[PDB]
A paper describes a structure:
In 2020, Tan et al. discovered that BktB from Cupriavidus necator is a polyketoacyl-CoA thiolase and demonstrated its activity to produce polyketides, including TAL, through repetitive non-decarboxylative Claisen condensations with acetyl-CoA as both precursor and extension unit in vitro and in vivo in E. coli. One candidate, BktBbr from Burkholderia sp. RF2-non_BP3, exhibits approximately 30-fold higher activity in vitro and supports 30-fold higher TAL titers in Escherichia coli compared to the original enzyme. Additionally, we resolve the high-resolution X-ray structure of BktBbr with three different substrates: acetyl-CoA, acetoacetyl-CoA, and butyryl-CoA.
Comparing the apo structure with the structures covalently bound by CoA esters, no obvious structural changes were observed. Both acetyl-CoA and butyryl-CoA, acting as starter substrates for TAL and ketoacyl-CoA biosynthesis, respectively, displayed identical protein-ligand interactions: H-bonding between the keto group of substrates with C95 and G387 within the active pocket as well as interactions between the CoA with R226 and S254. Among the mutants, S254A, G255A, and G251A substantially boosted TAL production. A shared trait of these mutants was reduced CoA binding affinity in the substrate tunnel. S254A, located adjacent to the CoA tunnel as observed in the substrate-bound BktBbr structure, led to over a two-fold increase in TAL production, while S254C decreased it, implying that not just the water network but also CoA chain movement are vital for enzyme activity.
Author numbering:
A (entry chain A), B (entry chain B), C (entry chain A), D (entry chain B): 6 to 399
The structure:
Amino acid sequence: AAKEVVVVSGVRTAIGDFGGSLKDFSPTDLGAKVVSEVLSRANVSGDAVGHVVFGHVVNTEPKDMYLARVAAINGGVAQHTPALTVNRLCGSGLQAIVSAAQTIMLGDADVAIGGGSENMSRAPYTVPSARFGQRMGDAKLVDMMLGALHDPFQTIHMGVTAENVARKYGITRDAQDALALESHRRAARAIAEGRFKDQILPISIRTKKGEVAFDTDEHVRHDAGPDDFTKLKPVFVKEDGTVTAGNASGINDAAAAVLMMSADAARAQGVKPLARLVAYAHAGVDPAYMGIGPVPATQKALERAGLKITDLDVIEANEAFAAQACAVTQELGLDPAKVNPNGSGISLGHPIGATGALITVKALYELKRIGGRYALVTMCIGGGQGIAAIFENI
Amino acid sequence: AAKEVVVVSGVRTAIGDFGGSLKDFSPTDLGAKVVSEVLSRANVSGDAVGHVVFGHVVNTEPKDMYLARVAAINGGVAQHTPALTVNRLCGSGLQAIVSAAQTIMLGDADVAIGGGSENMSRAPYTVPSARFGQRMGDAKLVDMMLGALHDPFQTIHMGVTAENVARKYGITRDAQDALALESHRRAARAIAEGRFKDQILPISIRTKKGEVAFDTDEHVRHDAGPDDFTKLKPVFVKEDGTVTAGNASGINDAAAAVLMMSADAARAQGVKPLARLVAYAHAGVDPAYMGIGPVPATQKALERAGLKITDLDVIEANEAFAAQACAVTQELGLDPAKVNPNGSGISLGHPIGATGALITVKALYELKRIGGRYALVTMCIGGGQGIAAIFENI
Amino acid sequence: AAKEVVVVSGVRTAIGDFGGSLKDFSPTDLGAKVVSEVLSRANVSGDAVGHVVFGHVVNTEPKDMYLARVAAINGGVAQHTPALTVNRLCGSGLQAIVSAAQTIMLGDADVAIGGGSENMSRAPYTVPSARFGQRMGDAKLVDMMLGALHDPFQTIHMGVTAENVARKYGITRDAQDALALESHRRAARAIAEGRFKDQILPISIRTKKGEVAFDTDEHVRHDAGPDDFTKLKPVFVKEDGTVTAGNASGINDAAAAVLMMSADAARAQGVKPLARLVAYAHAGVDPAYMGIGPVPATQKALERAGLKITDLDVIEANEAFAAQACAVTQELGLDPAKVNPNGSGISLGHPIGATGALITVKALYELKRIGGRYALVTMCIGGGQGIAAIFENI
Amino acid sequence: AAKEVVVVSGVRTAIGDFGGSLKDFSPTDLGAKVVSEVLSRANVSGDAVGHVVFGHVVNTEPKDMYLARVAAINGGVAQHTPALTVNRLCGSGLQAIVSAAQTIMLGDADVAIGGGSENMSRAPYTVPSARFGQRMGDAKLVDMMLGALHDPFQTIHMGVTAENVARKYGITRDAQDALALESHRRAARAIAEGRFKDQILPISIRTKKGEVAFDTDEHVRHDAGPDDFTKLKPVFVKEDGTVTAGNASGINDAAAAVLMMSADAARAQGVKPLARLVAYAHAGVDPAYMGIGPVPATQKALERAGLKITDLDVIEANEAFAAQACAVTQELGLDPAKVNPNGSGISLGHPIGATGALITVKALYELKRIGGRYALVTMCIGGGQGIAAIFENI
Ligand SMILES: CC(C)(COP(=O)(O)OP(=O)(O)OC[C@H]1O[C@@H](n2cnc3c(N)ncnc32)[C@H](O)[C@@H]1OP(=O)(O)O)[C@@H](O)C(=O)NCCC(=O)NCCS
Ligand SMILES: CC(C)(COP(=O)(O)OP(=O)(O)OC[C@H]1O[C@@H](n2cnc3c(N)ncnc32)[C@H](O)[C@@H]1OP(=O)(O)O)[C@@H](O)C(=O)NCCC(=O)NCCS
Ligand SMILES: CC(C)(COP(=O)(O)OP(=O)(O)OC[C@H]1O[C@@H](n2cnc3c(N)ncnc32)[C@H](O)[C@@H]1OP(=O)(O)O)[C@@H](O)C(=O)NCCC(=O)NCCS
Ligand SMILES: CC(C)(COP(=O)(O)OP(=O)(O)OC[C@H]1O[C@@H](n2cnc3c(N)ncnc32)[C@H](O)[C@@H]1OP(=O)(O)O)[C@@H](O)C(=O)NCCC(=O)NCCS
């Protein structure tokens, strides 16, 4: 049998807007900041880490091809610790946590860090013709940010797959704008009641008026009213459109990480843990319907966990698009009060490579706030996949 | 305990030169070719795959951020199969195989494909200032290929870290050029004797003279003598250099993959496999001496396998630079006659993300050629890492 | 002897700021607008124009290589009229007027249009490596705007030559900021008293609040006080600097044109002319001291005209930099009250390719306002030249 | 009246192919070479030049906006000499000579240099969105070479306007290919007989094999037969095409210049000159039929010279496309045996901005070869123009 994996500590940055407060912080900078902090929060020496795994999708500079290693080293981890970067698109952050946990499960390590880091503001343009030349004719500057949001098979924006999911599963424009408005309100509540304070690492943003601490998710609209959403126009299809800029998640910058140990190593260190890993699962779906990826992934994870949907006190199911999150809640039969209690992608943002690790942090801190037992963390994946993990508060 | 992992089939493309015969084949195109071919070789249906993992470092286009999923789908793997892309720099190809093997070891899958794909000819240039503009003053087009070959801490070419290793471990220029020459002669002999024919998937390269079959590693110099290497000048340092273009590996394009099954699925199907996985290990080292990463990784892997250096019949240790390949062989006490019996990176090329999977294929087919039992696959990793795996012919 | 050249009509746009009101109007768009207007103001059929010549330096798109022809055709000139684009850097606009006048002097035409057009906001970046490729290493995005402001011989900004002129000719920082402040005030006066109303062609700038007329030179600071200038720091040299962002001309967008006829053709058309051409002259100087180009050019033009500095009632001597305009006024012994009566480059802006034609328009309308006889129009030229023209009110 | 203009000396480079032997020589480098050489040929001191005018269309770098001044200064012309760059598209080279001649005709100078320089291999790509950014979505790298070959009104390649002229003037494919073949044979004969040796300035082209002399127009096919042109397909229209790569001119790199003096300065110095300028003329035509621009220009020039078609011993009418070159010869009634006796754009190449000056040199040296008296130099101009000049051997 495989060893048990304990999550001793976790942290996240505040989520920055596209072109906002974190646009000057590279992904390796953010990665290192969260690495150093989870080491501190867990009281673990950087010399005792067995593995580092980071999720990350859009390379913004050469260093990013070394992201996990740079975040680890500059985060204070000894140079003898291996470092891996993983890309499962929007699930990369949770995948990183899964991969790090596997090294503990398999006995290759008894300490491992799993996280993600992404700065979409710094997403580059590429010139595929620049190495060997165009010779003649106009060439293209390729938007790698928009390219990461396009299905590679039909070359359609991820939002077109959201419309496919809305049409197929019967999700109205009214229903989408409902989830969007509430998400903003739950998040505004969370920021007001301070539910995010402990999990967020503040970052001093060197402004010209003197430094200021960036410690609040800036995508949230605190004045949210339903007219703000009904006035918007569908962005991804010309006819019979329903997905808008308002009911679809933002594009954002952020990083997050968790530190994990084997059950034995955590016992022998007097660390007060957040939770323990119960199970995980992966699934693939039709790429044209990638939004409902979380449904089979969540169902397989419950099977491995020996649990039922009704045992889940906290559900972090990323709101990539209101169109698909409604169908996920509907097809699984979830209690919308237990799903994204404090908002998600629509309100908080979607720093794709980091989202999976970031919402794992949310789920665990929510479990402590409410004294719950089981949390589900799931999200959809461009190209047609889903990923899901279940944690137990302890 | 952990389930035994069987490698039933493997394949690689021939290795194309920089700007050479595969310059027109995208990484996802190459990846799909090898996926479809390992499936046919293992006699496994595209609908029966538990997981796909591909190593890949330098994104050449948006599709590449979906590389594993595009290679799997366009290789004929059903859409219900999860796909993951991993980046551990030059170790990514072998990491992909380890990651895929781990899903079998952990029971999440009984069939998994591990591979790697890289086209360095198609490595792009980025424009960091394109999205938000430069306003005034010259800007830069950033070479992402060279970027992937620069240590991200000191911002020095990997070749400089090769000089550090040569200096520290007493690897003379004469010794480096002797290894480089012997690598070309071994590869030229392997080509002439047809040792690679079975493991190579031909690719039809549309030429204006009509289609021709690309099936021979074109970086190899078949009439090389010692003077061809002595005449070259050091390329990476201005003073006291030893590393030349001739005793450094090439930059290349290729793909490779292997198909793995749980031992029980292999028994039941009645396959005639290549090998079983015995053990694997990772290691981190000083980034400035990344070339000796294989030493601690190989030692940790022999420990886990309960094996000794003398039990190894075949060794594929990638020749990133003769400077480090010599130090690796010297520090572990390996027989140079058993190390890379048919050449390696200096003569065949180094298609970064695919090399680890590619040389695994080479190792297993060489085991079959000599009736050997154990093979070691190991390689150094930029940023200061090593990776190693041991296979048993069965 | 050579025929006499009459200026029957002229016009200019308001001068736009770098990134300001005209950033969406290409140079051929502005060129055509001023072409059509001078035809109207002169009551000349587009079928009766013998030549069109336009000055223009920085190509912003392929069309600009056809600038004179596009401005003429889209401006309403018949397709049988030849069209020439000329580049004498900052003197291009006056050069265009000179070249057009020469066709009348030589009897090749008895109707000709001379003008200039420039949009520095739309100045492009180039990629010299893009046609045949960089192969490897970082390449450069070249700022063609900044490149046009750099001396091609020593590769120094035009402002460094201003410091050379200030040092050599004894122009203090106090003296420079004095001319700068007054220039802004004279211009603010001119805008207030409406002196520019008749010469300016308004351009409707399609805003989202409904269209608005852009008819006022927007570089001018109406609140100008000497502390605004003394607080600034020298921009072009680190030591012993004196040229600042405040005493140096702006970079701007604008177009202007004049319509000219032979004396006979103007007689036989009942056109009420602005002025007639008296003489012109060219000079070259040390490129490192290009600022004092106007001095020898003005002296040679007076010789050809048979006039003295004291016969000039209006002087338009472009204020490229306060450092050089002070030396020009000083070395020629000019009455600063007669020099730039309504401001110049520092206050109004410097749309380089159009400036020469634009300030000719100013000089002629000032001659009418004050009932004067002779006007001088001169300017310095990057690379080390000067150009000057003298007109007579009639 | 106007002063008589004497061409005392002329020179050209050999014409390099696109991406060929002159790809590494900037336009200002080529311009300076010919400037220094016409000075040496005329036996005139660099300090005795009244004006310099250079034709140039496609800026390859910032220096090119200073092209005439850089060519003059680096050609050894004293800095007191004014320098002007002119752009009349393919007519720029001849326009430069006319503009320079006009300063002599008008008395502003007794010595002037007229030339042209273009390196199309070095034509750049622009990035219109680089300065202020693209924010989101793909952008373009704009090919400025192709841009200079597109009519700016209908946005069609010049080759499409060649089809219009072929259609309208009944120029068959057979007739176009007959002209193209004969052009190569005439040029190949001229090379073999050494007719160009005296007029060509060799350029040492630094090769890895050692420096070699570039002194032969390398676009010429010396073993061409009718089948080489009949096999080619139309390149510019999808239906009913006639214009091919074989019967269209090349895109090329070269420079040329001539040195002119007033007749009195030539008398006094005792030079042995090439020719005197007799007359010149311009014309505009329908942009869609720009290929017949030379017809009205040549007619207007013969009128001014008081000459007839039959008085012309030599004719250099640039072969932009055989389609228009045939129509030009047909519409004026020229003897094809006198038109381009040694080839033209189809065989020798078409280095846009330099062609007009280059073929002037060719015309004057051919006059000396046959003891002819009068030469016509004419060419069509994109945008719908023509230019023509007549010279007398003396
Ligand atoms: C939906 C999408 C196309 C919108 O992008 P955008 O237009 O650039 O977003 P912006 O905030 O800059 O502008 C949207 C406009 O809608 C309006 N809007 C958006 N959300 C709103 C809200 N909650 N309330 C009121 N108005 C809103 C804004 O006023 C805004 O107007 P402005 O541009 O004048 O400021 C883009 O965010 C997207 O692609 N989302 C999906 C991302 C994705 O695929 N993630 C991975 C999937 S797993
Ligand atoms: C060393 C390096 C900078 C050379 O770049 P390159 O110029 O593109 O290399 P090429 O093989 O294409 O050609 C180099 C020149 O040396 C010569 N050359 C190459 N191999 C040779 C050999 N075995 N013998 C003699 N000459 C050789 C080539 O002929 C060529 O000369 P030429 O132009 O006259 O034909 C580059 O290959 C490199 O960086 N290698 C290291 C790869 C790496 O970092 N891998 C991962 C690190 S863990
Ligand atoms: C001088 C030069 C380097 C300054 O460029 P710039 O810094 O981009 O100009 P900007 O207006 O954007 O900024 C200048 C700053 O100085 C200050 N400044 C400039 N002029 C000022 C004035 N008249 N009053 C108060 N402040 C002023 C501004 O506040 C401004 O601050 P901000 O950036 O926060 O807004 C540039 O305009 C230049 O090159 N001028 C010469 C052009 C030339 O060579 N022409 C051809 C010669 S023949
Ligand atoms: C026509 C045009 C589009 C062709 O572009 P190109 O492909 O770069 O032309 P190239 O000469 O380099 O080669 C073209 C192909 O035709 C062939 N070719 C060229 N000339 C040939 C000839 N005389 N006979 C047979 N074949 C010929 C080349 O060999 C080559 O084939 P390959 O690749 O197998 O070697 C381009 O030359 C053009 O636009 N010309 C018009 C120029 C112009 O506009 N001047 C100003 C207008 S006023």
